[PDB]
Amino acid sequence: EKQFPPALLSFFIYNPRFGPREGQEENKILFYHPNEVEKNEKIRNVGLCEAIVQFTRTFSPSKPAKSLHTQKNRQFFNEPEENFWMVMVVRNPIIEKQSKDGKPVIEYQEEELLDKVYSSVLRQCYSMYKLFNGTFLKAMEDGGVKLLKERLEKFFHRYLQTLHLQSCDLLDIFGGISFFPLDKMTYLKIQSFINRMEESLNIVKYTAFLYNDQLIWSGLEQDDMRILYKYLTTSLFPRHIEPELAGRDSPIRAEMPGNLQHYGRFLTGPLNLNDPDAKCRFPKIFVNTDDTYEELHLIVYKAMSAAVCFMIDASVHPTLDFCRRLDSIVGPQLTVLASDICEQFNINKRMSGSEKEPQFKFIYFNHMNLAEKSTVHMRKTPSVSLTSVHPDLMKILGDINSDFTRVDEDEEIIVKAMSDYWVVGKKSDRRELYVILNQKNANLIEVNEEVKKLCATQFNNIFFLD
Amino acid sequence: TTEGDEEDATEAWRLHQKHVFVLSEAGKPVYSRYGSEEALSSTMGVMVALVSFLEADKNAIRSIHADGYKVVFVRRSPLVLVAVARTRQSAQELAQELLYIYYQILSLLTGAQLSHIFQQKQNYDLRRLLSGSERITDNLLQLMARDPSFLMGAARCLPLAAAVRDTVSASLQQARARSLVFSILLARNQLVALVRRKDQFLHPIDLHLLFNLISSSSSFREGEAWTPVCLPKFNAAGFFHAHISYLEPDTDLCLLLVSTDREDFFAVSDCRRRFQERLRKRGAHLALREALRTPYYSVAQVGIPDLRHFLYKSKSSGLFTSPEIEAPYTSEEEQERLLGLYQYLHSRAHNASRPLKTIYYTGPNENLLAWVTGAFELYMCYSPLGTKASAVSAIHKLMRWIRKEEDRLFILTPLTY
Amino acid sequence: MGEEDYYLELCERPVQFEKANPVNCVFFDEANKQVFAVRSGGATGVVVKGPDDRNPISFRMDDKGEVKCIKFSLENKILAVQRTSKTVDFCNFIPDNSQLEYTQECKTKNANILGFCWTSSTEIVFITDQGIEFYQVLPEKRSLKLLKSHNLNVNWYMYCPESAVILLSTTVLENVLQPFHFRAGTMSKLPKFEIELPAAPKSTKPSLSERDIAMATIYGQLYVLFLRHHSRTSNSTGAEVVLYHLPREGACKKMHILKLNRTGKFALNVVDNLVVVHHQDTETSVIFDIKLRGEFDGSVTFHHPVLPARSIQPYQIPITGPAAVTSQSPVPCKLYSSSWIVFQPDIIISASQGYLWNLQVKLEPIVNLLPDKGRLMDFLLQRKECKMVILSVCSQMLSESDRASLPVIATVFDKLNHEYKKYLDAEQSYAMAVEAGQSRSSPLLKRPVRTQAVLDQSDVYTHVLSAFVEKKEMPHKFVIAVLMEYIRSLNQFQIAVQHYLHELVIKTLVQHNLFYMLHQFLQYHVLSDSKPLACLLLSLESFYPPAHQLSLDMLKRLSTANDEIVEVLLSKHQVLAALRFIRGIGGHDNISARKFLDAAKQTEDNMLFYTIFRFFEQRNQRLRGSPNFTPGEHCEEHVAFFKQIFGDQALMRPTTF
Amino acid sequence: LLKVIILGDSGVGKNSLMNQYVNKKFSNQYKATIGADFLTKEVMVDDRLVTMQIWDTAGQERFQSLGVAFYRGADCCVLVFDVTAPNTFKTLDSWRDEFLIQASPRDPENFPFVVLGNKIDLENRQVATKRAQAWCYSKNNIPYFETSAKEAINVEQAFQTIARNALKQETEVELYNE
């Protein structure tokens, strides 16, 4: 038996104004992955997506198409900037089953994908590109279609190698910032330290403060912090924490001369402060791309577990003297603070005794501070987490989420699957809470009671219904 | 004529909620539901290309989704059907609605006669073969939007007296002619009794097409008009024949005698009176008329506070019951809105991959429960101020009122010729 | 040098009296701090001037010989005069009354009175070269009943009134010290101790004069100061002043040392718990603090001078006398004159001019001569009257001219809140022991006095942070940093954060359009819950939209603000949600049929509103008794929606039992 | 109604060549002259109203395989070739070939075509009109018309003969299929 999971069939970006006249149709395509496809096939897929948009603009001239479904692919569109359409073509699952005549046959499981997961992934692609490389039209006014195409290729040709659509789920519909639980005292200490640092480093312009890969503080705005958080916890922290799991024989840790009086150690830019000609290659992000359009060097300094993200303005080039001074200043302070928060978190974990695994496996998301919590997803690998419950229940949660959004009010949907698994979901006060209860032989009232009990244990200070 | 009128028209032609078009595999408009058949070629020219575009590269267009309104494509050998809904209906349900429209076009003229007239010339205009008979296919959507038998795929039997049903069904059972297959006695979209040829089986899609046939035109009320009809789900090959005695000139109680040959008008039309006479002399005709005086039973009879409507279907037999939808859902719009909710629960509890057996939805409007088990599918609809305890209590109270009053509101014994 | 250069000033209203001339003998009583000027010549006309005394005590006595010493008892009731070598006279002093001198001679015949000490209002000690004799005065009887005594060889004596201790130098080298205390008219023995001597030359034997010892009351404790001059050698570390701690119980222990880095003559004083030393050779004054962190060599604590040596502020004596009509300039008294004599505490007398001064410490000038705000605060948290100057520092620490680094502000606030926390703990313990049933006559239950150092949030809100925030000169990031720094110090010393501080943080966070900062401070519970804060957030609904929701859940976390939640939900038109909420707590029987469906036609699904009227009696009809509402809540008037009515509802079956 | 497919050639205002006759921007782009343009008009032909549904087929070899389907049930195929170009005349006997192989109507030898020579206003004509006329005569009398899509002359009569001959053909279709 074979269960072919979904997989990125294609991805492209076009603009239906470029090459307005025939003989110039190839000028519509600004990017196409994979690039080895016959040119006529490129223009056929682009023509089909543009035709579908032009079609569903006959019935609602303001709301163009958002996804097209077929037998072997679902194609999700997106218009992030005026007339710059992106399209992602995913492949439906396949059940390949051996027949008794000796010929195994393929059945395209047409109705197994969720529109929301992959539309979110597509908008996430655009927003990550926006963070790391500007916008689409600013790049145009800067350097023409040639520069636009070059930037698009150089970013996406590498980015799309880390879209693992085989494991996309609800937590991608969410796209949230898993916060760290802290009390008044430690959080105010963190504010004191951040103000100290930013004032003793007068060129530092913005700041973020992560702990254990879970955000704590964020100087940036809200729309520009979720992308940067996804980048920090997907592509920055795992690669630079892996050497501590791969051992002394790593080709990067060997060139990492640490400091003895403080555990401070960089993660971007000059990673080894002793080589006197170390280069200051800091990643360079774009924030507030709507109003002020700032370009900032990103300096991730990581103590034991905590991690400050300083954002220096564009022109102010940090010299290696600046990096040595910054380490000398921040290392001891950040080591003290990281030890403080680690001790506090350990003591708070011990204070909550080892009660049996909470029989409600939930998922929580807060549409305003983008907090997000889950005990159905286990961190098997820190880059992307893998769930801990049946895939059937995950698709059930997907269907529930898809049934919610139709009106933005206080709703709740309880369900019992034929495995007798109870699945609850509430949407209220701009929050969504999905719960799974493996309670066999239950009834609706006991299940409502159980959701009440979990809500009182964890979200008591979080508005909800009884 | 200035373009101002055309502008006002097409600006108000797109807010309609259930645009349905059906066209031929060439690109010639067969049927257009809310628009003129002339303009909505050019548009709907697009509609065949998009299908024949994705058909080139070993694929098929299956649906388009904006945010707010789906657009569903369905293909059958001689016709493609496209439905631009604006509702909360998953792609599958709209596909079922289009398949009903297609099985309807199959009922107007046989389905082995479409393959033939389109394998002979793909140029064949089909809007001048099934011309005039649009309101047979234009109301079927309205029945699809108000009557809940479609979403449930079962016939709603009339709540007749326990014994009177046996008498009327016996009067039916006696008049068995050789050129007969089914004898159906329906009363205004409800199934009083039915007697099929022995060891035969009817399909609810066919019953609903006959319901639409009768409820569509008014001619059926004057006298016995002997008409042909093919029931596509039973035998797609050839025609059947049936005629329509609206028994009492004031009320509406038609019996159906579907037959196997075309010129048996008299051999089976005798069965009309050979049936009516014994029933009328039994006096059971008076009890039938009296039950017909009020065929809809409200929900207050159940004696349940916080309960606005319900549907109940018995998997054992295959029929269902439902009160009159009356209290807030009276406006012909709220009727579809409520109807769409049971559509949601029925699709959500019958997803062959992931099946459920208890739902509950506590919204900013009617909040509903949907129980399902081996024997029966029970769907309800409350008032939003209903605690879960109150709903789980009403779901046993109503079930008791059903199991107690069952034999009155159902058809318990299948009658065979 | 301007006024911003000196810190030791003199009294604005000094005591001017008749100067010292061979006819008018002048003496001083440190116990009562009264100067006697007696014009002899038979009719000894004595005038008495004190610091508090409004009208100088003027009177006449007879010249019964040369007057040697004169002192009044406590409350100034009894006068005692030593005029002879063995016999001291006394007078029950009633003003405007003739008093008979009664004479008492010492018990030991060959004992010579050095003087006397009015230990209390009715008891007195006589120090003779051969011992001490403690009597009590019987003025109406005009006799002295000898209470106690002790015969001992003596070089000289010294008396401290506030601690009421006599000290006697007995050994010929005067380096052995016999102290004696007095309490409740009872004499008590204090243990003897010894003074180490510095290196002496072979030209004489160094005699420890009366002028080398002093007694002081520093931080409530009794200290013995000895002025030890380092004889001139190549290793001359300058002269010093050693503070032997003399406890009321236990051995007198050398505890503190004071380095002068000078050689010559010195005049000591104690002003506002500081030890002031004047070097007369170069007219310099140095202040020592004993509670400032000093060099602890493991045995004793050494202290540098707190500030750089300066001269006492040049003083301007106000003109007095009948010649004051002419425009004469003020006379500046001769600072550091050789006629300046010192008495503990803080009393300097000038016979050359006949003036009396109580040296004082100004605190504004130390805002400049000491920049280390850490030590500066360690210094201003001990002196009295330190609230105006501490607030001036705290507000100057934030002006753009002298804007201080942030750890400096953190340390300053930590010290202020340490004082505040001490006061709060003392007050809580007092109130708890008061409710615990302990009486006021208990020596442990005294209400803790709130000193001038304690700066509660009211002060740091009125004098520091309000103007600082409203000045709009500082970079707003600095302003919010200072605010959250104050709040951090507070929450660290486990103090309650007054809600108005949170209102200030919100005012500032919104005024500079920092909104996600407000969201984070709300999410992590830095701006704690309240009804007024919820009102403020809800008011902010226009600028930053989620604030509305940020308010709502706040109200929910209150659990004491139900009706507020209900009115805000009615405002947001979530009628169904308000209803499903009030039915949750339990008030669904007490609610009014009016509001929920009189605010009905504003959402127009009237069964979205009339589900409820019958429901309104589906709960409690048994209490009243009617299908439609009666005037129970004036609802009998409020039947006005059944006009366009759809369907058949029309009444509740009024269940009555 | 008449499903008329208008074979053209890319290069001559393929995106503005047909828009004179239908007099309205119904057809814009929906896989249109990148796929095939869809545009209609009512004609009064022998006092009968005919509904011409017009599919301009893009000649791009990248967009050609959609020709097998777009040619189903054709009532008239109209060939547009340039009088100023000899190459699209040489191709005129290869125009009909692919159309007859893919559309494959029942009776191809008499299936109605119409040849249209556009851009007559432009000077320096390379194809003598008589050349195309002789092609038509040797091709079983396919009606031909010279027209100017920038002048809108005589194209109405081209659609006129389209609709008349194809009305004969459609009466024949209904007669055979019954």
Side-chain angles (χ1 to χ4, degrees), chain A residues 340-385:
Chain A
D340 219 31
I341 314 170
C342 181
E343 178 275 340
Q344 194 139 108
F345 151 66
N346 266 321
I347 300 323
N348 254 21
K349 152 190 188 172
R350 302 145 61 266
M351 189 176 336
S352 294
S354 165
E355 61 262 340
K356 53 210 80 173
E357 200 245 354
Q359 274 55 64
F360 25 64
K361 302 203 135 195
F362 70 105
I363 272 181
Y364 168 57
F365 178 62
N366 176 357
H367 274 266
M368 298 162 327
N369 60 28
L370 312 116
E372 163 207 306
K373 191 174 184 174
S374 316
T375 88
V376 311
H377 289 92
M378 309 284 97
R379 167 152 45 170
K380 274 307 158 218
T381 79
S383 203
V384 303
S385 63

Side-chain angles (χ1 to χ4, degrees), chain C residues 170-366:
Chain C
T170 164
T171 297
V172 313
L173 193 42
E174 307 174 83
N175 71 285
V176 171
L177 310 92
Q178 173 52 57
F180 290 121
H181 182 262
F182 303 95
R183 63 183 62 175
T186 77
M187 173 158 207
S188 59
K189 204 271 177 190
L190 316 174
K192 259 178 154 193
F193 55 96
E194 200 266 0
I195 298 284
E196 166 223 324
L197 269 67
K202 207 70 52 163
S203 45
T204 190
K205 192 53 198 154
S207 159
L208 321 174
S209 146
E210 302 213 68
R211 311 204 321 248
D212 318 321
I213 298 310
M215 301 204 292
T217 162
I218 309 178
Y219 294 108
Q221 291 286 5
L222 178 43
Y223 297 95
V224 202
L225 316 90
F226 165 57
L227 168 46
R228 154 172 172 173
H229 313 262
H230 192 162
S231 311
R232 283 73 51 207
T233 181
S234 151
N235 297 44
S236 183
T237 37
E240 66 188 344
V241 192
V242 47
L243 297 181
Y244 290 80
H245 183 169
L246 162 61
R248 286 200 156 185
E249 290 68 62
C252 154
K253 45 163 86 168
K254 52 217 311 182
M255 278 308 319
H256 290 268
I257 322 288
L258 302 194
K259 315 166 302 215
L260 257 156
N261 315 326
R262 261 161 186 140
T263 35
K265 59 160 53 62
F266 298 114
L268 290 69
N269 279 261
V270 170
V271 300
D272 212 342
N273 288 299
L274 293 160
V275 168
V276 162
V277 166
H278 320 287
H279 176 242
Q280 299 264 7
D281 317 355
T282 69
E283 319 171 324
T284 65
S285 74
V286 293
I287 62 175
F288 301 66
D289 183 308
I290 308 90
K291 263 209 194 318
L292 273 200
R293 65 239 178 293
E295 183 52 276
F296 190 15
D297 60 19
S299 55
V300 277
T301 325
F302 283 66
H303 307 262
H304 264 118
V306 156
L307 274 192
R310 301 261 188 173
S311 95
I312 304 178
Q313 195 198 331
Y315 190 76
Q316 317 304 317
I317 295 191
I319 62 151
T320 36
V325 169
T326 187
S327 89
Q328 282 204 260
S329 325
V331 194
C333 46
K334 178 44 190 51
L335 267 59
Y336 302 86
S337 203
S338 198
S339 62
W340 268 13
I341 311 108
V342 301
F343 290 121
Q344 279 63 4
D346 71 286
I347 283 201
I348 43 196
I349 204 70
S350 45
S352 51
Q353 316 178 11
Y355 284 90
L356 161 66
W357 293 297
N358 242 31
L359 178 61
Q360 301 193 329
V361 163
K362 321 185 77 177
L363 286 185
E364 256 90 355
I366 318 196

Side-chain angles (χ1 to χ4, degrees), chain A residues 315-328:
Chain A
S315 80
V316 176
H317 223 314
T319 89
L320 193 46
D321 156 84
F322 174 83
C323 275
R324 304 189 152 159
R325 170 206 189 192
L326 184 139
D327 173 87
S328 67

Side-chain angles (χ1 to χ4, degrees), chain A residues 179-180 182 184-185 187-188 192 195 198-199 205 216-218 368-369 429 459-463, chain C residues 406 477-478 481 484-485 488 491-492 516-517 519-521 523-526 549 553 556-557:
Chain A
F179 278 94
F180 190 67
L182 274 197
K184 266 209 211 186
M185 208 46 249
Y187 182 72
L188 286 165
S192 208
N195 294 302
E198 292 174 2
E199 175 175 333
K205 201 175 183 187
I216 295 191
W217 160 261
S218 160
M368 298 162 327
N369 60 28
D429 312 72
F459 311 83
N460 156 53
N461 36 279
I462 297 279
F463 227 133
Chain C
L406 216 104
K477 216 205 222 180
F478 176 85
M484 309 303 305
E485 184 53 85
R488 172 224 85 105
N491 280 318
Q492 178 185 9
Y516 197 64
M517 198 158 316
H519 212 154
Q520 311 210 46
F521 289 157
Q523 166 191 355
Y524 268 105
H525 300 326
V526 163
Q549 182 59 61
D553 188 274
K556 183 244 178 169
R557 302 193 302 268

Side-chain angles (χ1 to χ4, degrees), chain B residues 217-243:
Chain B
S217 150
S218 51
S219 76
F220 304 106
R221 309 177 133 275
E222 287 323 302
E224 31 181 353
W226 158 275
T227 208
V229 60
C230 172
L231 3 92
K233 249 316 171 187
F234 183 54
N235 158 46
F239 262 86
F240 276 11
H241 275 83
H243 87 99

Side-chain angles (χ1 to χ4, degrees), chain B residues 257-270:
Chain B
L257 300 143
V258 296
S259 47
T260 37
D261 84 80
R262 50 173 26 253
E263 41 211 8
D264 219 44
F265 176 92
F266 301 99
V268 316
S269 183
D270 205 299

